[PDB]
Write a protein that binds this DNA or RNA. Structure first.
Ligand SMILES: [Mg+2]
Ligand SMILES: [Zn+2]
Ligand SMILES: [Zn+2]
Lengths: 181, 65, 46, 147, 115, 136, 391, 30, 266, 56
DNA sequence: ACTACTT
DNA sequence: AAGTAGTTCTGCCGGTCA
RNA sequence: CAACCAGGCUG
């Protein structure tokens, strides 16, 4: 997101605005205002690694922008928007991730490595890789009888089509010692 | 992928309720949370069942011979 | 299938610099997804 | 396996009558051991469960996305809103005697994957069989009945 | 593959008897009965009841190992009282109590209205 | 074929349940020799105990006028049970708190106890045998 | 196969279902876990060949290992975590059940031992029946901390003639410890008797625990309302304790500690502050956790988890690091591009203030990764590097 | 007020747009 | 009446909330279990496939067919194929159903549990009727099909209990509770601050007197009075799933005497 | 190194392991299918002639 | 890598 | 002193070719 | 009854 302080009516601020957005969900609901439009309208731009070197990013658009004049004891503890030079803002951090990690629920609550594990195993799992398996003659392939979409979810999943082609089941799990088996 | 007959967990029949639930949603315009309560699916073992099924079969049917 | 389509190979030599997760990697490559041992960090995912 | 590098294999299976239960009837489909939580430090598993117990009750696709404004504190409130213990636990009875279990157990759903790798494609044995030609030693490969 | 047949959980196999009673040599006047093709259901109960005959010095039972449908029951009784009998009674009692529970459940039921 | 081995009442100096939902270690002094001290853990569930209390304590090796334990049956049997708390355990050590003040320790399957004084010279045998009893 | 124990001679017991089933206490010597591990079986062929295995390398013998003149197998996991609870003075068992525990022990001389408590209700104590498993002539004396031949804390361990007199039984007593209940039974009664003790102890505790139950869940990872607030400030204060030294060095008012740069010496202080902070932040939560806490109970018996475990879950994760130094400046004079140049504060060199219960921030997360990614790497190095050494 | 700021939730709508056009495998294609 | 008494709280066609009082927990449980596992019932258990073009694979369907509840009122007068003397099976030991479906409809045709068609003589007895509780009365959507998709198979329902496979269980969930106010101390509540506050009270706290401080600990206090609720799937009338439970268990306890007898001959 | 110092051998077997809290320390549960493949050459002796003939 | 022997 | 090749952990389990 | 290359698990 480009944040250029072009706000003659306030501080520095994101190019894109609630209008741009409802104007997009407009087209979402029609299934004219593409991604390419957000781009040509210089609201969002592609910055590589090299060019990243010379800019300053705001994690959350909100949080890291309006001024400051209590805090939730349960939530985590965020640093701050101590800056004004903000040239860009991250669409959402959840995007540093990759398809793999993107299906891991609450990965912001796991010991780092544990995330790299499930990141490899999900590729050892079973489900429904395509809906036309009935017609494919691939050597070896497994389809899970009754796949249930997960109860826990990720806004990322939505684009990975996970809910339409899951890879597991919601099992009623009890954590306890029993027989000892 | 066709509804499961009966709940994995407690065995309580559930193969019928598929269609009912789907209308208590599209037609009766209700929320899942209760559309289920309506179909008698009390505790979660049975709930998680319907609430989660992914009726892929449809996409399947849609092929040919 | 998706994840394989976004896979990166980074040929080796004979260290640990390349195997490690760099800062510039933020936003570009995944911080958690990489093969254990052997070619760890040598194979990355966008 | 769960979605937290929590791999494991079955060790035995029981039917509802032997399985421990909650007065409400519900019984488990899986029983993992408490020990694989402390040292693994995979709280996510723990939360996904509390969140899913809820979402299953309310029928609202629980959100466990990366960095959100959700909290164990919040989730615990919605689950209390439904009558169950605030943290998940429930009282359970030992299916053998029917007597209560002095402890409470972290109950509730959790997405579990069934990955390729089932014993019967592995379990292999051999006492004399095909021998290589150059070497004359046993051949390599379960498929080929090697040793 | 190495799966045992599901019915073996309750069908006595060629040449096996539900009961098999061996006299425990460790202590005096006490025995060990092996119940083939049975489980907790039956066991725990015959153990409980057996735990009332105040002429029964000891009573306990255990399922050898999950894989196998069967359990051993050790019953020790007061002199001159043979445990085989002690088992008999405790058995009957259970039947009698159940029968009652049946008449009674039926009583209440017949006196009801469905909706 | 036996008899008692120690008798006297004490008063609860204090009762303590350090992280023990169902048990408390207690200590009281003798209503006679200001020599006899006492330490005793107690199942304060099957017999509560509140500080400042008149408790008769006893010992001895029997209960009638061991081996396999039998259930009640004793609906009508001898029963040195003339109390409302009777444990059983073993004597592990016979310390010598210097001077002429000897002390013995008894454990009742986990629950411990400590005695003092110096008159159970031919009484407080060092044997395992030892039923403890308390009344009031 | 790293040492003798990775290969042991076992007694076959043909059973059903497709898997090799082995006892748990012999799990550690192979390094075996059940997350899908495979194991090989070799069957002797000669009459003397088998002899070689049965007399020379049967598990019972392999019990007390010369690798470290101490036993190499003990009680673990369930049986361990459970054997502690069965023991606590607090725990008592009633007849109907005690009669089962008794039976379950394959040796039991069919002699119901006198209840410790006769009075109102005849009761038996965990220690009691547990000791029906420990043979006679077995003597053991410990003395942990406030141990006192009357150990109030129920410390150390005093077992006589094979009977538990006082003190809980956990890892240090029934584990593969040097003074081992095991190390003793083995030496004292034979590889044989000991071998069967693992048996009994297990079948007893395992069974008791089947009914007493045990578990764990988020509820056990939450730090008491104030004890947490109290930790948030233990963090904060150290933040300033650092902020200061930071300016104190921006002004050129620091004694380059002998042999180190000003910078070198600077980070050194910084670090020792943040880590020091976290460790207490942890300890704080660790004592604020009552005994009913499951995660603690496991830590007590010593079946799983340790300090830093509790710490990073309930308290503060800690300062992430790479190659020793805290996260570096990959980006010119900064860690991420979400920071301004020349920043040395904790919120930038990789100090994860949040607890795992709370949830790392996008930076906390990515710095944490860079950190993990380091372990995973050398873990794949030390491994092979070791292998060659070993050979 | 087709010119007001934009809070968290909003960003998603943009992300949706992204994939609508580019697609998870874009790179391999282009 | 005489021994362990009952007192049915609510009661329907599918559940039977009720209070089993003055019994032994062991027994309450024994029955509890017997209900879930050893009650006889009928279900499809063999599926001969002549033709299938569905998208669901043979055994996939076959699997389901076993779960489609069937009538089992008179099950107690149908023999176990294994005990009957026929070379395999007869009307004396089994029911035979049919299923033929064709995609005639221009829009997804539906195969339901109702489409089953008994073909064996039901020798005049309530048995083998695809139990329906569906609103439209079609119950259990077996499967769907497109244009010219066909599905012809035959079924053979036999006796059998839950231990052999779940599809024979009639029970399906059973509520079991006792001593709502932890008076026997059979549990130890986990808590952060207050046990009573964090741990919900049960709808059964009512039917039993609250604790009330002062009072010491009732140790001789045993446990009678269990708040059970026996649901059902239909194959058998909720009442039965309790009577037959009560009975089945009775017969087992019986056989043990009978065994002690033949064993007495020598 | 790969043929002489170590080699593939007959009479060996391998599957997935699972702990059992019901076997003595020194035992090892063996799947029937395996017990049935793996064999042991035993010499016919008056001590076992009968036993063996039964097995044969 | 890391170490010997070569270039 | 630059440069080159051996050894770099263990075992199990899809495509071209003389 | 084989090589060669490549890829994937042991968490
Ligand atoms: Mg493993
Ligand atoms: Zn259910
Ligand atoms: Zn027939």
């Amino acid at each position: 997101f480009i944040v250029e302080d072009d706000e003659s009516l306030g501080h520095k601020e994101l190019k894109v605005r609630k209008g741009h957005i409802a104007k997009l969900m407009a087209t979402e609901y029609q299934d004219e205002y593409t991604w390419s439009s957000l781009l040509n309208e210089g609201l969002v731009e592609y910055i590589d690694a090299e060019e990243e070197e010379s800019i300053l990013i705001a994690m959350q658009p909100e949080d890291l922008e309006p001024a400051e004049a209590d805090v939730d004891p349960a939530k985590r503890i965020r640093v701050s928007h101590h800056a004004t030079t903000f040239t860009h803002c991250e669409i959402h951090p959840s995007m540093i991730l990759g398809v793999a990690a993107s299906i891991i629920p609450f990965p912001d609550h796991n010991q780092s490595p544990r995330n790299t594990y499930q990141s490899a195993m999900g590729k050892q799992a079973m489900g429904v890789f395509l809906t036309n398996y009935n017609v494919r003659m691939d050597t070896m392939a497994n389809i899970l009888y009754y796949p249930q979409k997960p109860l826990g979810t990720t806004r990322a999943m939505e684009y990975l089509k996970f809910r339409e082609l899951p890879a597991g089941q919601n099992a009623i799990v009890a954590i306890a010692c029993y027989s000892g088996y | 992928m066709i509804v499961p007959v009966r709940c994995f967990s407690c065995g309580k029949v559930v193969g019928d309720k598929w269609e009912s639930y789907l209308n208590l949603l599209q037609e009766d315009e209700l929320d899942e949370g209760t559309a289920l309560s309506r179909l008698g699916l009390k505790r979660y073992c049975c709930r998680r069942m319907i609430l989660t099924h992914v009726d892929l079969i449809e996409k399947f049917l849609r092929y040919n011979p | 299938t998706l994840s394989h389509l976004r896979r990166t190979n980074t040929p080796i030599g004979r260290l640990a610099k390349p195997r490690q997760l760099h800062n510039t990697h933020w936003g570009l490559v995944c911080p958690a997804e990489t093969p254990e041992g052997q070619a760890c960090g040598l194979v990355k995912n966008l | 396996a769960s979605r937290h590098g929590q791999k494991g294999t079955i060790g035995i299976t029981y039917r509802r009558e032997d399985m421990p239960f909650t007065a409400e009837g519900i019984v488990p489909d899986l029983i993992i051991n408490p020990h694989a939580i402390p040292s693994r430090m995979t709280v996510a598993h723990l939360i996904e469960c509390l969140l899913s117990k809820v979402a299953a009750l309310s029928g609202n696709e629980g959100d466990a996305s990366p960095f959100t404004d959700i909290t164990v504190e919040g989730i615990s409130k919605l689950l209390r809103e439904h009558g169950y213990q605030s943290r998940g636990f429930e009282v359970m009875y030992n299916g053998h005697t029917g007597k209560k279990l002095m402890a409470q157990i972290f109950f509730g759903p959790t997405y579990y994957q069934r990955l390729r790798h089932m014993v019967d494609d592995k379990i292999h044995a051999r006492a004399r069989g095909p021998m290589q030609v150059l070497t004359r030693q046993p051949v390599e490969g379960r498929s080929r009945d090697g040793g | 593959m190495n799966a045992p047949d599901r019915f073996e959980l309750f069908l006595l196999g060629e040449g096996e008897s539900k009961l098999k009673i061996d006299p425990d040599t460790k202590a005096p006047n006490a025995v060990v009965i092996t119940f083939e093709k049975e489980d907790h259901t039956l066991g725990n109960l015959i153990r409980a009841e057996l735990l009332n005959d105040r002429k029964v010095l000891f009573a306990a039972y255990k399922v050898e190992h999950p894989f196998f449908a069967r359990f051993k029951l050790r019953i020790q009784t007061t002199e001159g009282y043979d445990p085989k009998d002690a088992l008999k009674n405790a058995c009957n009692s259970i039947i009698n109590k159940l029968g009652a529970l049946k008449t009674n459940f039926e009583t209440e039921w017949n006196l009801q209205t469905l909706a | 074929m036996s008899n008692t081995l120690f008798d006297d009442i004490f008063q609860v100096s204090e009762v303590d349940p350090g992280r023990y939902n169902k048990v408390c270690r207690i200590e009281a002094a003798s209503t006679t020799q200001d020599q006899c001290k006492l330490t005793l853990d107690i199942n304060v569930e099957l017999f509560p105990v509140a500080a400042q209390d008149s408790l008769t304590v006893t010992i001895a090796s029997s209960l009638n006028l061991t081996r396999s334990w039998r259930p009640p049956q004793a609906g009508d049997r001898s029963l040195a049970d003339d109390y409302d708390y009777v444990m059983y355990g073993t004597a592990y050590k016979f310390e010598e708190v210097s001077k002429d003040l000897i002390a013995v320790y008894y454990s009742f399957g986990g629950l411990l106890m400590r005695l003092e004084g110096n008159y159970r010279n031919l009484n407080n045998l060092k044997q395992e045998n030892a039923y403890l009893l308390i009344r009031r | 196969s790293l040492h003798k124990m990775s290969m042991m001679a076992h007694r076959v017991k043909v059973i059903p279902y497709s898997t090799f089933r082995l006892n748990l206490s012999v799990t550690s010597p192979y390094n075996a876990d059940f997350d899908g591990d495979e194991m090989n079986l070799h069957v002797p062929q000669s009459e003397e060949t088998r002899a070689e295995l049965s007399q020379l390398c049967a598990v019972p013998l392999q019990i007390v290992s010369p690798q470290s003149n101490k036993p190499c197998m003990g009680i673990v996991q369930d049986t361990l975590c459970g054997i502690r609870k069965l023991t606590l003075r607090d725990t008592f068992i009633e007849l109907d059940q005690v009669l089962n525990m008794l039976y379950w022990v394959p040796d039991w001389d069919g002699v119901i031992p006198t209840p410790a408590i006769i009075k109102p209700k005849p009761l038996w104590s965990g220690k009691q029946i547990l000791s029906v498993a420990i043979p006679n002539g077995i003597h053991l004396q410990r003395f942990d901390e406030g141990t006192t031949l009357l150990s109030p804390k129920d410390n150390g361990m005093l077992i006589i003639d094979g009977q538990i007199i006082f003190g809980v039984v956990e890892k240090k007593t029934v584990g593969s410890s040097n003074g081992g209940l095991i190390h003793v039974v083995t030496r004292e009664k034979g590889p044989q008797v000991c071998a069967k003790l693992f048996g009994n102890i297990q079948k007893v505790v395992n069974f008791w625990l089947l009914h007493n139950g045990f578990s764990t869940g988020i509820g056990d990872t939450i730090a008491d309302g104030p004890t947490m607030r109290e930790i948030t400030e233990t963090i904060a204060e150290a933040k300033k304790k650092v902020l200061d030294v930071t300016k104190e060095a921006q002004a050129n008012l620091l004694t380059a500690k002998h042999g180190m740069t000003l910078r070198e010496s600077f980070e050194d202080n910084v670090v020792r502050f943040l880590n020091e902070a976290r460790d207490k932040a942890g300890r704080l939560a660790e004592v604020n956790l009552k005994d009913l806490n499951n995660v603690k109970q496991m830590v007590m018996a010593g079946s799983k988890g340790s300090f830093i475990n509790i710490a990073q879950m309930s308290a503060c994760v800690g300062q992430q690091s790479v190659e020793g130094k805290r996260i570096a400046f990959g980006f010119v004079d900064r860690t991420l591009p979400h920071f301004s140049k020349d920043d040395y504060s904790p919120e930038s060199k990789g100090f994860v203030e949040n607890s795992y219960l709370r949830g790392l921030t996008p930076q906390e997360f990515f710095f944490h990764a860079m950190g993990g990614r380091e372990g995973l790497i050398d873990t794949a190095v030390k491994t092979a590097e070791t292998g060659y050494i070993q050979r | 007020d087709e010119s007001a700021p934009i809070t968290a939730e909003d960003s998603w709508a943009v992300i949706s747009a992204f994939f609508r056009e580019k697609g998870l495998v874009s790179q391999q294609l282009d | 009446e005489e021994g362990p008494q009952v007192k049915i709280r609510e009661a329907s066609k599918d559940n039977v909330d009720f209070i089993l009082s003055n019994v032994d927990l062991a027994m309450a449980n024994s029955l509890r279990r017997v209900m879930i596992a050893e009650i006889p019932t009928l279900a499809i258990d063999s599926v001969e496939v002549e033709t299938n073009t569905t998208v669901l694979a043979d055994e996939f369907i076959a699997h389901r067919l076993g779960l489609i509840p069937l009538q089992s009122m008179d099950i107690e007068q149908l023999e176990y194929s294994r005990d009957c003397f026929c070379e395999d099976h007869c009307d004396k030991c089994s029911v035979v159903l049919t299923l033929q479906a064709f995609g005639e409809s221009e829009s997804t045709t539906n195969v339901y549990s109702k489409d089953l068609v008994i073909v064996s003589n039901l020798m005049g007895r309530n048995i083998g009727h695809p139990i329906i509780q569906d609103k439209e009365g079609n119950g259990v959507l077996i499967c769907k099909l497109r244009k010219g998709q066909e599905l012809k198979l035959t079924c053979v329902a036999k006796k059998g209990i839950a231990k052999e496979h779940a599809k024979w269980g009639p029970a399906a969930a059973i509520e079991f509770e006792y001593d709502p106010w932890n008076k026997l101390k059979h549990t130890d509540y986990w808590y952060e601050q207050d046990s009573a506050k964090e741990w919900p009270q049960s709808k059964n706290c009512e039917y039993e007197d609250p604790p009330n401080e002062g009072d010491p600990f009732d140790y001789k206090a045993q446990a009678d009075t269990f708040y059970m609720n026996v649901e059902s799937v239909g194959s058998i009338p909720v009442d039965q799933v309790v009577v037959r439970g009560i009975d089945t268990l009775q017969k087992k306890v019986a056989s043990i005497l009978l065994a002690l007898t033949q064993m007495d001959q020598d | 190194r790969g043929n002489l110092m170590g080699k593939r051998v007959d009479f060996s077997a391998r599957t997935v392991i699972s702990g059992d809290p019901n076997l003595e320390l020194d035992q090892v549960g063996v799947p029937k299918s395996i017990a049935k493949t793996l064999t042991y050459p035993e010499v016919v002796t008056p001590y076992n002639i009968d036993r063996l003939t039964q097995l044969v």
